Ligand binder design. Structure first.
Ligand SMILES: CCCc1scc(-c2cn[nH]c2)c1C[C@H](NC1=NC(C)(C)Cc2cc(Cl)ccc21)C(=O)O
Ligand SMILES: [Zn+2]
Ligand SMILES: [Zn+2]
Ligand SMILES: [Zn+2]
Length: 378
């Protein structure tokens, strides 16, 4: 993984992309890494915000699956035609595979203004792939076609998606693993939450309601409604020397200080304790104010340092987004159904354990089984 270090570009606001070479003759495109989804989908027509798109008509190796796919999000959507093509990864391992690829032909609110990426690489499992779980995800094709070890890691600074390996130059200190609770999203278990060493003291199921996932495709740390409210009440108590407007706590508004006077100082650390591999252990990742107060420097208040609060409310569980992954080298150890975290080599954000609980309760939440998911065979 000499040749693989530093193969990523981007930032939390706009995302992290990897280079991918699709078809013969080759088209090299910038692809958003997304651990919250399972489709390889590329922009495939002109669009105001796209610098490059996939031109199926220049690819001699493209095969139409003669099926469309419709992907709605709360916020927008994308759709296109399913196909397959040859894929290799310029920085990645020296292999070529034939993968599913959705040619995005229409979308709404998916591509963002000068993102520098043209496509999405869904790295979660086939259980959440569209249109259904028989469309094999990219990484599943990679591993089955090539003997690449079944693991990848993300160092989110530039940055590095390391394929099939762990690289020790990328982190310092302990690598701590938390078990994958279920292979669909990269679902994990949060056993405890502290804000400035103070335990939030909720039933630990409330932290994983209805799931907790590790998602490179979302910007914020997202927290279930009740957890969000309790954290904001607490973070608020800790910085009560500054009274912000509501819109700031809603993520709707910047607050500012005279350039270089920010009182980081009054903002607390957030520790999430992740379930350990050993069954009464846990470990914690500690989030700095700098990870959750994101700088945005707009225009006419050029002289101030200004920030967005990057913790937001959720009704679909906890999402450990990019602002959280950034401080860490994260190892998606698929082969062993675990996720590893260590301090990135790119206060300090900390990975710390072990913490032992004598009576450790089950913190996972079982989602009500709909007749729909019960019907389908697997
Ligand atoms: C760390 C990368 C975060 C990114 S990259 C592009 C966007 C985006 C926002 N609106 N449209 C795209 C975002 C923000 C992100 N939203 C989204 N992330 C991806 C691109 C993975 C899927 C998606 C589809 C749609 Cl249709 C709208 C937003 C998003 C979020 O909700 O936090
Ligand atoms: Zn490159
Ligand atoms: Zn059957
Ligand atoms: Zn299935």
């Amino acid at each position: 993984f000499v040749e693989m270090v530093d193969n990523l570009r981007g930032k939390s606001g706009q995302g992290y992309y990897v280079e991918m070479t699709v078809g013969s003759p080759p088209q090299t495109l910038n692809i958003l890494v997304d651990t919250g989804s399972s489709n390889f989908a590329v922009g495939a027509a002109p669009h105001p915000f796209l610098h490059r798109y996939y031109q199926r008509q220049l690819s001699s190796t493209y095969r139409d699956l003669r099926k469309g796919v419709y992907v709605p999000y709360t916020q927008g959507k994308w759709e296109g035609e399913l196909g397959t093509d040859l894929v290799s990864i310029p920085h990645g391992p020296n292999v070529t595979v034939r993968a599913n690829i959705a040619a995005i032909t229409e979308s709404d609110k998916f591509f963002i203004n000068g993102s520098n990426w043209e496509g999405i690489l869904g790295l979660a499992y086939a259980e959440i792939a569209r249109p259904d779980d028989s469309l094999e995800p990219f990484f599943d094709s990679l591993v089955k076609q090539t003997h690449v070890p079944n693991l990848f890691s993300l160092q989110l600074c530039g940055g590095s998606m390391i394929i099939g390996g762990i690289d020790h130059s990328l982190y310092t200190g302990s690598l701590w693993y938390t078990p994958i609770r279920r292979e669909w999203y990269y679902e994990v278990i949060i056993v405890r939450v502290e804000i400035n060493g103070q335990d939030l003291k909720m039933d630990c199921k409330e932290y994983n309601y209805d799931k907790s996932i590790v998602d490179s495709g979302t910007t914020n740390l997202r927290l279930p409604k009740k957890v969000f409210e309790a954290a904001v009440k607490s973070i608020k108590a800790a910085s009560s020397t500054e009274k912000f407007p509501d819109g700031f706590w809603l993520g709707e508004q910047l607050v500012c200080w005279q350039a270089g006077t920010t009182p980081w100082n009054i903002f607390p650390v957030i520790s999430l304790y992740l379930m350990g591999e050993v069954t009464n252990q846990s470990f914690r990742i500690t989030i700095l104010p700098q990870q959750y107060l994101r700088p945005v420097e707009d225009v006419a208040t050029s002289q101030d340092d200004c920030y967005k609060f990057a913790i937001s409310q959720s009704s679909t569980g906890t999402v450990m987004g990019a602002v959280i992954m950034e401080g860490f080298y994260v190892v998606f150890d698929r082969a062993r159904k675990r996720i590893g975290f260590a301090v990135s080599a790119c206060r300090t954000a900390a990975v710390e354990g072990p913490f032992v609980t004598l009576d450790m309760e089950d913190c996972g939440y079982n989602i009500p089984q709909t007749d729909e998911s019960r019907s389908h065979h697997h």
